[model samples]
Target: AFTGKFEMESEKNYDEFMKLLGISSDVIEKARNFKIVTEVQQDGQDFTWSQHYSGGHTMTNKFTVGKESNIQTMGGKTFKATVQMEGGKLVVNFPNYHQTSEIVGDKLVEVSTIGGVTYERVSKRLA
Candidate 1:
């Protein structure tokens, strides 16, 4: 049921999160207001997700549930994490951050927490 095309509508505490990730101010300024498009394909324990940014950059990943996968961040850092389904949400623990994503109502909700700072992204399904 989490398979859909979505776009980011609003974000919360993103600036702080970017700062914590050591992203430069100028880069953050450009990305802070850019629109992001996301697509997800899920089949049982397998998933393929992609995110597109207005800056013409994309981040994508494909992995199986309960297996460790290599992940690269927009900030140019790479890490390994195991993706798992917990409480009906896809949870992945990246280096220095704990991420959880789920479909809530008609929106795709993702939350990332690090160093006690929490960032949230709420995306609406594309028609």
Candidate 2:
């Protein structure tokens, strides 16, 4: 499996991203107890973000931990997830994100392939 550094955002930025995605305040309220974990692969190309929560259980609720947008518009590659609470926390695993970038302050953040691609390595790994 591939791995990379995890980025945690300030509540302000995280809330804004959720708002931009049309996530409701009620959801955010429940999401307050959750921690956001972002998995950036190949430095920053493909990735996944997880939101883990612990609270009262509900059957019909949406849990969105993190989101990444396009250069021009929203939703270039947004991670949508459904997780089942095993014990006390909600664990949502988002995977298979394509290359994308977002403007963060005066800087730009992007995700690249998880290091150089090697056919032999891939073939052996697959096999």
Candidate 3:
């Protein structure tokens, strides 16, 4: 369940969210313009999630439901966080923001919010 290969089709509020996280303007410029491919493999409870970004940058994280795992943020910082699955939505707390992802109608709809801004990425299934 929740296993698929998806690629980002649209993004909203990404710049504001990254700015809240203090991401560099140059990196933010590159990040928002590039597409992201997300591939995930899940077995029972554990999951391996790989997000392939542009400019040859990729980040992967593996964790079981309700367990702490080392996750690397898009800004190239790795930290420990607990991932929770609730109501078919995976919730993760990053260093500067909180993210929730849900699979909806062949789309990986991920939402990240910090303070008052929310960054939304909608990815359509590729396979």
Candidate 4:
């Protein structure tokens, strides 16, 4: 039900969120107004998720629900994590951050938390 393409709509609390995540100013400047496109392919319990960032910065993660997989950061740091479905949301617990994503009323919504900072993105369905 969650397999499709999504286009960026809006973000919430991104500045402080990335700041706490250690992102540099110039780095954040480029992504400040960038539009990220996400495409997801799912087959049973497995999924291939791709995020196409501006300037040709693209990242894809392959994993299966309920199993640990190596997830890489935008900076290319790899860490193991498990994708779990909690309350209909795809959830993940990173080393120091938490992620939750779900589709609501035809919009894809993602929320990330680092300490007390929260970053949220809502994307419209494209495919």
Candidate 5:
């Protein structure tokens, strides 16, 4: 399970992904780092997820399995999405994209796709 705290190991196609999300180039450049930490607290069906960024910015959201929750991004963008477990993976549909996450080995792999662009984020579990 992906219940532990994890830090970003690598991000693929992040520049394109941020562009699609309407993020500025300056922000994208400053946002590229390995300091993003994701802390997930899961108890069977309920989950409290927290994302900590480098600049003391954090976004925390709670959601139950198969339920909709309003979540905010590190950039302060708010959106509503329903989180569910599908095919052993956690899936969420954002405003214009869908993300699927699964624990592969010791890393949490999150993939998001929209149109023809795809972004993948790999996070390693903390010791």
Candidate 6:
């Protein structure tokens, strides 16, 4: 069966975590058709992030960074992309629109207010 294979987040402790997983920029960038960007606010916690080959039906996510605050890579190279916001959440106008934004809150907390669906992060750091 197809397993969960898309994720994005950033924290003081979690920064560079993806890189540690051997995800070269080239790979991560190529994953989402080479659209990579660091659009997290805070003027610091923000860094470049991306997805790849994530072919799925359109879904929705809220509160993602975009525009002057977003990053987008292009042309086999990296660059800042024009981020867009939607109804009530950050919208990635891809064929099948879905979102995976890093928000501020407790560790691995689940959110249940978008598209009337419950979303949670399964973490290994539990008591």
- TM-scores for all candidates: the values are 0.88, 0.28, 0.88, 0.88, 0.86, 0.24
lDDT of 2 by residue, 66-116 (tens): 433222112234444433233322233334222333333222233322123
| Superposition TM-score, candidate 6 onto the true structure | 0.24
Clashes of each: 0, 6, 0, 0, 0, 13
Which tens-of-lDDT digit does each residue in 1-127 have in candidate 6?
0012334332232213334334467654443342112222223223333223233422222123454342332123233333444333333333212233333332222121223232333221112
> Cα miss at 42, model 4 (Å)?
2.1
The lDDT values for all models are 0.78, 0.31, 0.80, 0.77, 0.75, 0.30
Candidate 3 contains a number of clashing pairs equal to 0
Compared with the true structure, the alpha-carbon lDDT of candidate 4 equals: 0.77
Poorly placed runs, candidate 1 (over 4 Å) = none
Rank ordering of all candidates by lDDT, starting from the highest: 3, 1, 4, 5, 2, 6
User: Which run of 10 residues does model 5 get worst, by summed lDDT?
Assistant: 70-79
lDDT of 1 by residue, 1-127 (tens): 6788888788899899888878888878765576678888887788888787743788887767798778765555778778899765788887667888999756788888878798899878873
lDDT of 5 by residue, 1-127 (tens): 7588887767888888777778777778765755577888777778887877744877686777687888775333788888889665798887767777888756777887777888888878873
lDDT of 3 by residue, 12-117 (tens): 9998888888888887887567667888887767888888874277778787778778887665478777888987678888666788889876778888887999
Q: Pick the lDDT winner.
A: 3
